[PDB]
Assembly symmetry: C7
Homo-oligomer: 242 residues x 7
């Protein structure tokens, strides 16, 4: 810190939004242009705010339930242009020594690519061992959504209550993430292009009655809504658009 190293104190906005219907995945960005001209480059923080609904839906009617395996959100840009990607508040941090049920990873961010993976880490239901996005339990398969042990009603009805499950699976997950874009200032022309994906890595989960002690089977990333969204970031005017 500044005091820790004897440093004394060295050290215009807008709120875009959109939404996808067939997929069902909300979107938003909040940008800032504090206009201190004394800084080298224009700084822009892309708050990935939105709502990727849980889509915790029983599509198959045996009965299959589609659930969110990954709210992967990532910013990618073409090669020809001149800008670069610099920073991101959500960072893979040294896991010191709790096991949170969703692990906010950041894909290995190669220059011009920063991608978070809001993964479904080990989650506890009905007071037993937990299970993650790739939860595959030799007895209950993906043991995400078994309402009880000894159910008696219809299989399609006999799904873990969306209320009892982790609140992200039922409603969805709102990303609280940020990353930034930078380059030298004095270049003649400034513009980039982005490719957002809000990949709700959909995960088909066929729940079926096999015999006596219930059993689960799951298929990883069986579907997906790589709802590839493109934003149009207008850096000169200090506005962000699509």
């Amino acid at each position: 810190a500044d005091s820790d190293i004897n440093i004394k104190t060295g050290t215009k906005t807008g709120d875009l939004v959109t939404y996808d219907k067939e997929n069902g995945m909300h979107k938003k960005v909040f940008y800032s242009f504090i206009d201190d001209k004394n800084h080298n480059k224009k700084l822009l923080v892309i708050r990935t705010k939105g709502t990727i609904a849980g889509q915790y839906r029983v599509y198959s009617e045996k009965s299959g339930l589609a659930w969110p395996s990954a709210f992967k959100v990532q910013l990618q840009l073409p090669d020809n242009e001149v800008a670069q990607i610099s920073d991101y508040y959500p960072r893979n941090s040294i896991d010191t020594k709790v096991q949170p049920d969703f692990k906010t990873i950041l894909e290995s961010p190669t220059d011009k690519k920063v991608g978070w993976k809001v993964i479904f880490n080990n989650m506890v239901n009905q007071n037993w061992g937990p299970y993650d996005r790739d939860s595959w339990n030799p007895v209950y398969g993906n043991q995400l959504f078994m309402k009880t042990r000894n159910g008696s009603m219809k299989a399609a009805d006999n799904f873990l209550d969306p209320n009892k499950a982790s609140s992200l699976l039922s409603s969805g997950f709102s990303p609280d993430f940020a990353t930034v874009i930078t380059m030298d200032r004095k270049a003649s022309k400034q513009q980039t292009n982005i490719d957002v994906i809000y990949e709700r890595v959909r995960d088909d989960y066929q729940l079926h009655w096999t015999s006596t002690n219930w059993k689960g089977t799951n298929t990883k990333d069986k579907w997906t809504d790589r709802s590839s969204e493109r934003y149009k970031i207008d850096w000169e005017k200090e506005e962000m658009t699509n």
Copy 2:
């Protein structure tokens, strides 16, 4: 966070009231603006403050118990208007790892409807287990309001006192929630419209005696005092008026 990105740091109010005599629900909102020449557009903030009384009463002479299963508030709007919905604090925070008695949810918010279900999760009754909203037991059924085990007086007098139960069941739960909606600044037209379907998802607790041990039963959604009170937002005047 803000320091983690090494940024220097840089990125009119009123009130309302109304009550329902039949259903007994108090409703309020509060707003605030800034005249920020740097910010893009106008922002209005909706606080859901109010009092959805539990009406924890023995209406029917087991007892039928009109208790609030899940107060729910939804700020829903017609499609035709040009508005859009942005932020919904509180969000479903990553279930991080505590079992709160009312686990608030942000039901899967489409771009147009965002609605919490501040549901009734576990409640400890007379030094025993969780007993969530849909708490339902083979023998004792739901277990919200079991005054005691070995009662001896009239059953109508044998219902858990509101004082000992969760303080929300007795006297309701004041919603402490908020959200905001957005739109471009340079649009000619302004008008919007709200729904605010205040809900009190009533539910029943029937303690029926077997002659060997008490039981319970739950008639979920036996009523719903969903006193839908659509609100009116007066945006240009920088006022909110019902």
Copy 3:
């Protein structure tokens, strides 16, 4: 919250006193007017402060023991006037997971009625057991005020000292509560009445010695020294009178 919403801005005073000799009812209403032109209303913060004396005493000698069952403050208001009860702290907060002795509840309120009940939710006597008011331990009835199990003097001189008991019951409880009232500013007539009833639920306790191993009973709600009061709110004069 406000940062989670990304906004940086959060979205004339006095005092009074009065006493009652018969029942010792002190009242204090330190108040505030914000002289804010950005606000379209007036606030009257009601510091619910006073001396609701414990009156822990052996009123009659066996010897009956009067003590505070439930301190309450009900800021009741006449209906004809146009005022309305907007907000209030404390609130019935979501139970989370501690069992405090005095459970500050907010009785089922309405536009006109807001009632706290500062109920007695337990105490430990001689380092054994959480004994509350609604606690009826037929072996000891309400276990509030027994100094020791094996007394040997006159019964009247064997009741729990005002010191060892929970300091609230005997020395008295001081309320720390508030509730706000609001109404539109453009009202033609500026005046509304009020009726705040300070009410302590004194509880009879005919503590008597039963000759085998001490056994008590607790007759609830014998005496209730309900004390009213009025404050005239002169909004036109920007003051509150009486």
Copy 4:
């Protein structure tokens, strides 16, 4: 609170001193005013900071052992005067769930009389449990001041070291409390009087020897070296005068 009610804000000194020889206790007060056009009335603060030397002394040579049972500070005023006691900190607060060894209560304060008794709730001697002023060990009586169990010298020397005992007993307790008194400013007459009490309610613990296994005996509140000191505060001149 204030923010919880959705509001931002809205709401000349002296250092007296005095002491007494025979009783041996130190005394002092502090105050402060304000000048607000917005506020109505006038406020004042009285802090009872001082030093009441516990007199942990072997008064008689068994050897009679004087010690401070009940430190107290109590402010009382004549009736005919027009003033009233408004506020006071600390307050008898709600027990939650620790047993502090020197408890502080606020005896039932009439509008005129307010008093604390900073009670000796316990102390641990050689790590064998808690014992208050009204401690009565059936074998060690009030077992505040036994140095050990197996002494061998003159009994006048086998008394607890002030060092090991609670730091208040050895050298007294300094009150850190305060009260408040208020009145309307537009009064023709502006005078009152006070009666402080620094009643170091001592307690004879004449500690003898019973010749089988040391046995302790106490006589509660034998004397009181209650200075009963009477103060007079120079209210009118915006000062306090000795």
Copy 5:
């Protein structure tokens, strides 16, 4: 603590980026100055955010597994220049008594070089023993990467899930460390140089089946992506441009 020393408290930016396609590690620095007539000289802060992808990737197809072991970002300057390294953070600090997975260290810093090592103190796999970077389980070898202690598919498929491992093994680790230098002001000559050797000392892990239980083998420092980068800090013009 300035208060502990008894004294009342008392006492231009930019950014860059560059990427390597073969090795693939992002780089970054951020600086600050004050025009302080109280400080004798200027200061720099060299933040080393960057990003070093882990390359937790199967190199040999048994099947080899390249992965990052220690991100030893170090900074060093030519001897001839008048520069000398003054301060740095983090500092090797006293370890009280937690074993954080990555034990960041500052290599023995001579006055010319200050080099941090981001080693893996220990990582936890499938809820059993911890496993350091230079961990060597004589049977399970290094233990950073084992999808299961009992697998059945192709060996290349049976390597630890990158998501399950520490979020720094799979997606790499971006250091948050910094250091500074401080040169006299009166000097006639004002330039220096730097060499920053970003490091990814990629270590191998091999699970070679022994026919009785899985057995692991590792080759310390089998490679290194010593990007061996070389920066050119433009000290003179109150920038860091290159």
Copy 6:
């Protein structure tokens, strides 16, 4: 807590040192003055920081070990003067029940005398029990300064490590304590005098080889190295000097 009482808030320096060569006594005082147009009298602060050598040393070799039984500090003034002693930050605060090695005390401060007792409440030797200023371990005497169970060399060398023992013991202790003097401003006379004592109440601890294990004996308070310094304070010119 003035905020707890509903009010907003509870609304020339130097230094000296002089050394005692024989006793190794380092002594300091710090002061602060303010010209407040609101306070009634004058203010000053006396902070006895100083520093007291340990004197862990074999002055004579059982073997004598003159360790600091009691760092003590006590300002004292002549009787005739008009001054009085009022305030002091360190206090015999309620031991809110946890056994510090040095429990600092404030000896019963008369109006004239305020005296602290920085005493040895305990410390641990080779991972065993606590032992205080009067640690009278009938086995090891003062169990403070005893090396080990079975030292075999010349026991003039077998003495507890001055490093392992509590750091206050060998390397000395520095008081961090303060007190204050108060008087009216209207008096014609402006004088005061002091009588400091820094009695590092020395001790003697001497192990004793009785038969097989070790036995100890300590001649408490054998030397009181009373560095009885007679400080002088020049109040009128707002300076302390002597």
Copy 7:
């Protein structure tokens, strides 16, 4: 704090560096002169910053292992000069009852000698037991760098890896301490010298071999490569030249 004494908190710069080759000690100082005429004298505070390398180096091939036994950095001035030593942030604080590995005590100080010894009070090797600077075991001797309880490779190769040992041993320790000096203002002559004697108390750890369990030995303070330094503190010009 100041509030407890009832007070409203009424209480040119530069930097250096240098280094040595053979022993490898990096030394410097940060200082601040407050430009306030208010303080009686000139304020100068010395921070002992720098890195005294570990020299955790196997010089001889057991293995003679010279390690930092204590970074006993001192500070002393010529007697003839007139200045005095007063204050220092890191004290031998009351060890206020956890035992850390390094304890940075402050030697018994004087008006001329004030020196810490950052000793190796403890450390944990491979999770079997504690081991200190005086770590000696009749078998394992010291246990700073016993890599294992058994190794099959060459002893010069068999010695704890620097990474696993406490980060201070391998790389080195950087003092973060400070110290103060004092002298009156009115003095005619205005200069003084200083003798900063940095230090690295080297110490040897050797692992002897008994052929059943390895043995260890330690040679105390074989080297004390006590580098020296005599800062030329130019107080008047407000610079610590060198």
